[PDB]
Amino acid sequence: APATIAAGATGELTMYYWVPLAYSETDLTGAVLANVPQSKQRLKLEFAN
């Protein structure tokens, strides 16, 4: 992210998130076995405006 966007300038932001389901890569606590033919998962994402 640019630390300062001047009058007239344009800045480009980049950001990564990890939304966890399991606890870690060696601990499967909280993981979801998604082999469901009739129901779907949902990931609601609400962004800045």
Partner: protein, 84 residues
């Protein structure tokens, strides 16, 4: 041969709206008696002959006679008087 999900299992089928049950049952279609109509002719004026044909032609013959056989006037040899 599907594997049962133990975390998200499902049950058997529930009742749903149906397609008006008599409208999936047909009638049994009721045949009347029939007839191959008309009086059939016994024979047909066919466009091709119904018999065998021959691939090659063979020459045929008939015997003839010659005639009354006549005599002849031969030229006769000379006498063998130890010159011959």
């Amino acid at each position: 041969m599907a594997l049962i999900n133990p975390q998200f299992p499902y049950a058997g089928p529930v009742p749903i709206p149906g397609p008006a049950p008599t409208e999936t049952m047909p009638l049994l279609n009721y045949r009347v008696e029939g007839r191959i109509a008309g009086i059939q002719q016994a024979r047909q004026f066919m466009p091709f002959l119904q018999g065998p044909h021959r691939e090659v032609a063979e020459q045929t013959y008939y015997a003839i006679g010659t005639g009354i056989q006549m005599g002849q006037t031969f030229n006769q040899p000379l006498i063998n008087t130890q010159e011959g």
